[PDB]
Amino acid sequence: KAELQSEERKRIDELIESGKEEGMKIDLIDGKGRGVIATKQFSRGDFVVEYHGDLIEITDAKKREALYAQDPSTGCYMYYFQYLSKTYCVDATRETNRLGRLINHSKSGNCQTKLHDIDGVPHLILIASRDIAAGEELLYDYG
Amino acid sequence: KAELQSEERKRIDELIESGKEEGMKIDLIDGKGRGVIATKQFSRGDFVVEYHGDLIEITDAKKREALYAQDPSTGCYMYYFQYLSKTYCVDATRETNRLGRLINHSKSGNCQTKLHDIDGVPHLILIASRDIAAGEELLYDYGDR
Ligand SMILES: *CCC(=O)NCCCNc1nc(N2CCCC2)nc2cc(OC)c(OC)cc12
Ligand SMILES: *CCC(=O)NCCCNc1nc(N2CCCC2)nc2cc(OC)c(OC)cc12
């Protein structure tokens, strides 16, 4: 073990809250376009990056969705989930410098999502679903 | 006022439970592209069409989102809402004969959303936000409002 689990949790909390993202970079994938590449090896289970965005409840998510007035054909950055009796939305619509929202989707990726609680506040993170080689495209799937 | 409210509530319920979607058609909208055009007049407040899809709970919404495994850049047909303190999703991903999911979005729209109850079951419907003349493209706004 619990000590090591608590200590790894602390390192994940510190990375999440620091504002820093390492071990990855934006690159153009041949025949695909923009994507995120691992610039270091990842082991199955390792923290990759947060899917960073504003955490809001469903009422505020509806207010935001109504006001963006963006066309739905271009995709949505608002992700919904339930956590301890509440429904939340991680709204990553804002065009920030964060890499989590840039990781492409795949029918079989090397990143999976997990909810990571920080003092009763859930964070949507990407963890490695298998071992990842440096240079591989980071690809998520829901799962 | 209660009589007119009840008569209309029954009119909306019958249309939903019959599958028939009258006064509109699929068309190449002038100067834009594919959409839905009104083929009759609609007064402000009138029922236009339901945003038809599978009504599911959040657990099943997560499983479907995981199974479709679609590229998120092409848009999403899964609409999340709260009704009587419970979370729902109307999933219109399936390509059916239904027109509601084909109505284009616009903040300058002529259709607004409303949650319409049928024996405790919420249905997401589109209602005319203003008068709509025949030949106008139907366009939705997410607002109530
Ligand atoms: C990030 C916000 C977002 O994209 N939300 C998507 C909500 C579900 N998708 C969707 N919803 C509707 N509605 C909901 C309320 C009545 C009309 N119409 C849609 C229409 C289209 O295309 C015409 C799409 O395309 C993906 C999605 C719709
Ligand atoms: C109809 C299903 C759907 O489109 N769901 C949208 C979910 C929110 N959008 C979104 N989410 C993520 N996540 C969620 C869990 C970690 C990764 N990544 C996204 C990435 C991209 O592009 C790279 C988009 O593009 C619109 C949306 C994402």
Swiss-Prot record, chain B:
Superkingdom of source: Eukaryota
Record GO terms (molecular function): histone H4 methyltransferase activity; histone H4K20 methyltransferase activity; histone H4K20 monomethyltransferase activity; histone methyltransferase activity; lysine N-methyltransferase activity; protein-lysine N-methyltransferase activity; transcription corepressor activity
Annotated consequence of substituting C76A: Strongly reduces affinity for histone H4
Outcome of mutating Y140A: Strongly reduces affinity for histone H4 and methyltransferase activity
SET domain mapped to chain residues: 22-143
PTM comment: Ubiquitinated and degraded by the DCX(DTL) complex.
Primary location group: nucleus
Annotated residues for binding of S-adenosyl-L-methionine: K32, G33, R34, Y77, N104, H105
Location within or outside the cell: Nucleus; Chromosome
Domain-level remarks: Although the SET domain contains the active site of enzymatic activity, both sequences upstream and downstream of the SET domain are required for methyltransferase activity.
Protein name per its UniProtKB record: N-lysine methyltransferase KMT5A
Encoding gene (name): KMT5A
Shown part of the complete sequence: 236 to 380 of 393
